[PDB]
Design a protein around this ligand. Sequence first.
Ligand code: HEC
Ligand code: HEC
Ligand code: HEC
Ligand code: HEC
Ligand code: HEC
Ligand code: HEC
Ligand code: HEC
Ligand code: HEC
Ligand code: HEC
Ligand code: HEC
Ligand code: HEC
Ligand code: HEC
Ligand code: HEC
Ligand code: HEC
Length: 501
Amino acid sequence: PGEKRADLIEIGAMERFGKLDLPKVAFRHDQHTTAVTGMGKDCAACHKSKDGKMSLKFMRLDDNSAAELKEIYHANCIGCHTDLAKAGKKTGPQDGECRSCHNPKPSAASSWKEIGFDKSLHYRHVASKAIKPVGDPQKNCGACHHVYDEASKKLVWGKNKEDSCRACHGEKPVDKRPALDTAAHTACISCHMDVAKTKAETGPVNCAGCHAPEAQAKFKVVREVPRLDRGQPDAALILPVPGKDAPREMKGTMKPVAFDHKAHEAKANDCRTCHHVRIDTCTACHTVNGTADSKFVQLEKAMHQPDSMRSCVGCHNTRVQQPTCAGCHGFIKPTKSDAQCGVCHVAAPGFDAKQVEAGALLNLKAEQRSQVAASMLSARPQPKGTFDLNDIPEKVVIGSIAKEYQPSEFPHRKIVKTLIAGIGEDKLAATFHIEKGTLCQGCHHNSPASLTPPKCASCHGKRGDRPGLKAAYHQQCMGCHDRMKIEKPANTACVDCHKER
Ligand code: HEC
Ligand code: HEC
Ligand code: HEC
Ligand code: HEC
Ligand code: HEC
Ligand code: HEC
Ligand code: HEC
Ligand code: HEC
Ligand code: HEC
Ligand code: HEC
Ligand code: HEC
Ligand code: HEC
Ligand code: HEC
Ligand code: HEC
């Protein structure tokens, strides 16, 4: 139970040839790089090369056999350690110190953390003059990104086909695609090493350098990040693609949905958050039927899952948890209104309920789809807003059950004002608050949006499904103040809402 490291490797390559007699060998990679660095040596002390490519294996290009591995490790690990002891130098386990390498109880915990490109980190790479254009006057994407060309029989820079490495490089090597693991370590590190030789600004090479939280906290962050130009649409028409050999059950039920891609791109931290496997349509996997590709997660799940950041409702659902929205949204139950489904589910202008059943939207070119979506977006209703506050009692006197205390002097319009203020400019609120009275329903729930809401006592206090009057006031009042972090009147200060008799 020692210090947390990010450089731990469990050496157990021999286990694929059969059962190990001894524990796997814990190796601290960074502790070794710095020792070897200070010996005046480098990577080539432990990693061989082939055609320029450095091997990530220790002193070999292949694992040829169990006996060859053990020879390679014993000769080379111990050889160095032996030499260093011969000079009076800080060294590692010797010859006869079996258990010190084959250690069932290494005293070192893991601080290892995964690493990924931010909006910012991606741009630091794109904007780097040390990463020179390839296959274009300007663009340096081809220095890092590729696609297999079928016709080439080669990797090529596929213009506008860039994706996260995670799209193609997964947990294990599939076919000729190395694992994420291997791809990263091959591509990232070796470029960093190439650039460090030019003495320009570069990326990390030590394990901690990429994988330690403290190291990651230190990465220079750029905030002025332009749009990533991959030829993404500005507006998308998302369609109920039924699926190949999907039955009639699986045809489109709801109106289609124009999606503001441009807007959402600037509000997200990357593309991955949504395109979690692949940059493509969602419907390439999430048909209305569901595909193997998607583990049979259906279209509706992909778009409405209340607790996924991936889905429209799910991601929007974590937005309404911010203290600013939570006062109302921690209280109200969703209507699941036809009207509310209609915020996203919109009629497509040119083609009407007869060209649709037969595929008129489903066989549009992507450009055509952008126009039809562009058209839906710029034709949605204008953000309705609320009533004029002066049509609202400035102060309300909650007294109907006054007994142990005086009637409450509840600053109605003040509070409404502040709520609107706290929201201000938020595009979800502005769009999805579809009525002039929607905001009112934040407290005036289970009732049509209007200027003249019924009293609470028209439903509370007199079937045990709802609180009595006292409880309903206390729960609504105190609950919002909790959710919004309003210390203003404390829940504990009985007099601050209603004075003593
Ligand atoms: C570190 C410097 C080591 C010392 C000291 C000793 N061994 Fe080792 N050994 C080392 C490595 C990195 C490996 C590869 C491990 C793997 O699982 O891939 C090995 C391998 C062995 C094996 C074969 C694997 C197994 O059956 O567990 C054996 C049997 C083995 N080593 C024995 C052994 C003995 C008896 C040692 C003391 C004399 C000894 N090793 C020292 C690294 C190191
Ligand atoms: C000997 C003391 C080493 C030196 C010098 C360097 N590395 Fe190394 N590396 C070493 C071992 C024993 C292993 C495990 C693989 C095995 O065959 O036993 C590695 C592995 C790596 C990896 C993969 C890490 C992982 O997925 O766990 C990388 C990315 C790597 N090595 C890079 C690397 C670089 C860039 C070095 C020079 C600066 C370097 N290594 C030196 C042992 C040794
Ligand atoms: C020189 C080129 C080395 C090679 C090759 C390997 N090791 Fe090493 N090792 C080296 C040094 C200078 C040290 C001491 C580092 C320090 O700062 O004190 C070590 C130490 C170890 C240890 C002990 C780590 C600890 O907890 O204190 C282990 C378990 C170890 N070395 C294992 C190891 C293995 C398995 C190697 C081959 C894959 C190997 N070392 C190579 C120097 C060198
Ligand atoms: C940044 C340039 C890195 C350096 C330096 C090293 N690694 Fe790494 N590692 C890096 C990436 C981009 C990935 C893919 C997953 C991710 O975090 O984005 C990895 C992966 C690993 C793993 C993955 C194991 C798994 O369960 O998926 C391990 C165990 C690992 N890396 C170890 C490791 C070591 C020991 C390194 C120094 C020799 C090292 N990494 C360098 C990025 C970078
Ligand atoms: C190497 C230095 C790169 C250059 C030059 C460019 N990109 Fe890149 N990109 C790179 C990596 C290592 C990743 C993986 C990010 C991760 O953490 O998984 C990416 C990712 C992308 C993506 C997917 C976005 C996402 O959400 O991860 C896209 C669409 C992308 N890259 C496009 C792109 C373009 C258009 C570039 C040229 C201007 C470009 N990249 C450069 C590495 C590198
Ligand atoms: C899918 C379209 C891919 C994405 C996204 C990335 N890579 Fe890839 N890579 C892909 C294929 C089909 C192959 C195998 C090519 C073949 O020989 O048939 C590869 C290969 C690599 C390798 C192998 C070593 C090499 O010579 O380049 C590496 C190191 C590699 N890929 C790295 C890599 C990185 C770092 C990526 C993110 C920016 C990445 N690939 C994305 C397909 C795809
Ligand atoms: C060469 C084409 C590279 C590849 C492939 C990857 N990176 Fe890189 N990286 C490269 C350069 C030229 C720079 C300097 C950028 C600048 O600020 O001018 C960097 C920087 C980083 C950093 C930031 C380090 C810091 O500020 O301390 C990180 C974390 C980093 N690089 C990591 C990284 C990873 C994980 C990569 C593969 C997925 C990767 N880089 C690819 C050059 C190149
Ligand atoms: C945006 C935030 C949405 C709201 C609010 C609702 N839906 Fe949705 N839905 C959305 C998208 C982007 C999609 C994929 C495109 C498409 O039009 O299919 C969907 C899809 C569905 C589906 C599956 C397809 C179909 O059967 O036609 C259903 C059944 C569906 N939507 C129903 C639905 C209902 C009942 C809603 C109100 C409660 C509702 N959606 C709201 C995005 C959004
Ligand atoms: C979630 C908020 C997203 C972010 C961030 C990004 N994209 Fe996206 N994208 C998203 C959806 C819901 C759709 C429509 C999907 C459908 O099934 O029609 C898209 C669409 C695209 C496309 C077009 C795919 C096609 O029609 O063939 C591309 C090329 C695309 N998205 C790329 C992309 C990039 C590069 C992003 C980050 C820079 C990015 N998207 C962000 C959801 C989200
Ligand atoms: C096929 C390659 C896919 C594409 C294209 C998209 N997603 Fe996906 N989806 C896919 C898989 C393999 C899974 C299950 C395993 C997993 O990745 O978690 C899913 C599941 C979802 C879910 C389920 C909710 C959850 O548990 O996270 C959602 C909300 C989802 N997918 C959303 C989504 C969106 C909006 C996409 C377009 C940008 C999208 N996925 C693309 C496979 C695939
Ligand atoms: C009380 C005064 C509210 C505040 C503050 C915010 N919202 Fe709200 N919102 C309120 C009501 C009474 C309703 C109707 C609920 C229904 O299901 O019909 C809404 C509706 C929304 C919705 C649509 C449905 C849903 O996802 O719950 C969204 C997306 C929404 N509101 C977003 C939102 C955000 C982001 C807010 C913070 C800035 C916010 N609202 C404040 C009442 C109130
Ligand atoms: C919670 C923070 C509220 C918001 C937002 C709005 N109102 Fe309200 N209002 C609220 C309470 C707790 C009460 C007292 C009702 C009771 O039964 O004791 C009221 C009162 C009114 C009234 C007068 C009630 C009556 O006696 O008829 C009206 C006309 C009224 N509220 C309207 C109204 C409108 C139009 C709102 C949206 C702008 C609105 N209120 C917001 C709590 C909250
Ligand atoms: C009838 C039309 C009602 C009016 C006017 C008000 N409430 Fe209500 N309330 C009503 C029902 C049917 C329910 C249960 C179902 C639901 O939609 O929540 C409630 C619930 C509450 C609760 C508890 C919510 C919980 O999560 O447990 C509270 C605290 C509450 N109501 C308070 C309240 C207040 C202060 C009102 C005046 C503005 C009010 N309700 C009006 C029915 C009706
Ligand atoms: C504002 C956020 C409040 C705080 C803090 C407390 N209560 Fe309250 N309570 C509140 C309202 C709006 C009402 C309805 C008042 C009315 O006369 O219509 C109440 C009601 C009561 C009642 C019943 C009415 C009465 O007996 O006068 C009791 C007994 C009561 N409240 C007790 C009470 C105590 C002990 C509190 C502090 C611990 C307390 N309330 C805080 C709103 C708010």
